[PDB]
Design an enzyme around this catalytic site. Sequence first.
Site, PDB file in Angstrom:
ATOM      1  N   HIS A  71       0.822  -1.200   0.000  1.00  0.00           N
ATOM      2  CA  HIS A  71       0.000   0.000   0.000  1.00  0.00           C
ATOM      3  C   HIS A  71       0.862   1.259   0.000  1.00  0.00           C
ATOM      4  CE1 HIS A  71      -3.439   2.525   0.979  1.00  0.00           C
ATOM      5  NE2 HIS A  71      -2.633   3.132   1.827  1.00  0.00           N
ATOM      6  N   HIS A 120     -13.368   5.848   3.047  1.00  0.00           N
ATOM      7  CA  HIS A 120     -13.180   5.470   4.441  1.00  0.00           C
ATOM      8  C   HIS A 120     -13.537   6.523   5.470  1.00  0.00           C
ATOM      9  CE1 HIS A 120     -11.315   1.520   3.816  1.00  0.00           C
ATOM     10  NE2 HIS A 120     -10.993   2.048   2.647  1.00  0.00           N
ATOM     11  N   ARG A 143     -15.512   1.578   6.450  1.00  0.00           N
ATOM     12  CA  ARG A 143     -15.992   1.894   5.101  1.00  0.00           C
ATOM     13  C   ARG A 143     -17.445   2.374   5.157  1.00  0.00           C
ATOM     14  NH1 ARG A 143     -13.860  -3.748   2.110  1.00  0.00           N
ATOM     15  NH2 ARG A 143     -11.842  -3.719   3.202  1.00  0.00           N
TER      16      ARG A 143
HETATM   17 CU   LIG Z   1     -10.141   1.325   0.869  1.00  0.00          CU
HETATM   18 ZN   LIG Z   2      -3.809   0.141  -0.922  1.00  0.00          ZN
END
Ligand SMILES: [Cu+]
Ligand SMILES: [Zn+2]
Lengths: 153, 153
Positions: A71, A120, A143
């Site tokens: 990420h 988010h 979420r």
């Molecule tokens: Cu996400």
């Molecule tokens: Zn990610």
Amino acid sequence: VQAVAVLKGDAGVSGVVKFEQASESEPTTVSYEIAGNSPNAERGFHIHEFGDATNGCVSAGPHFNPFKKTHGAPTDEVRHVGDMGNVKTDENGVAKGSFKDSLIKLIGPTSVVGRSVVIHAGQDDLGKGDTEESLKTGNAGPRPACGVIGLTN
Amino acid sequence: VQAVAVLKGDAGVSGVVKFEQASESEPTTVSYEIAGNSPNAERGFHIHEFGDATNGCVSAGPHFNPFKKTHGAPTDEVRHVGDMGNVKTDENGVAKGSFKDSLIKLIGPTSVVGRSVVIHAGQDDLGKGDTEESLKTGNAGPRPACGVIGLTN
Ligand SMILES: [Cu+]
Ligand SMILES: [Zn+2]
Ligand SMILES: [Cu+]
Ligand SMILES: [Zn+2]
């Protein structure tokens, strides 16, 4: 090609995200308008793997990552294809803007059509947090809203 | 490949439609469970062109028809790719079943991933009505619920 995702949830957050890509090689332009967020904040915004809404935003799965990277921020060389960073909300809790991205595509084997957009409840640490989680989700949290990316004209 | 569409609306009708196709040449298996319909009735069921939910089920557009044919029954040689006929509801207003179709695909240039599934408030005349409309929509009427077809696992 044009696509659109309508973000819905039970938390008061809702919005629309539009995508446009002329040819596979061209960057995709992402435009969004999301309301009901916390005001003056940064909120995680990503494309998740599945366009499955059978279990709220949970069934959307993990961040779209066909290349199996960690990420990161949209500008990082190492990021998931679905990483769109944080959107900034104004004093009224509205996030509105647009950007061009070269990894997100509506054409080809990595097409995001049929997948989900998730907004988010927390800020994405952009993979800079010193946790294993930072490298997977950016610690963006819950979420509140999501939508399946569909084709449009 | 597996896909799913969650049917939502403001009319009390809701449901889930699953799709599964192994390879492009194989028939796609469509399974559905839809509740809140009129009991003991036949209701129009089709794949519409766009996966656009910005204006309810209206923005889904017309029946998916890449080959520019007229509206028909699923068993007709001349039908729109998106024509799935009528689903029968039981005494409790539930339509549940499955079928295999060779025109509907999740793979290739006519993929329905990113498009919409629409359940109607009326019966589809299967293009057998003596109206110009019969050949376009089957006179199936309003769209109480719909959903964008997304990818799943
Ligand atoms: Cu996400
Ligand atoms: Zn990610
Ligand atoms: Cu229809
Ligand atoms: Zn039709």
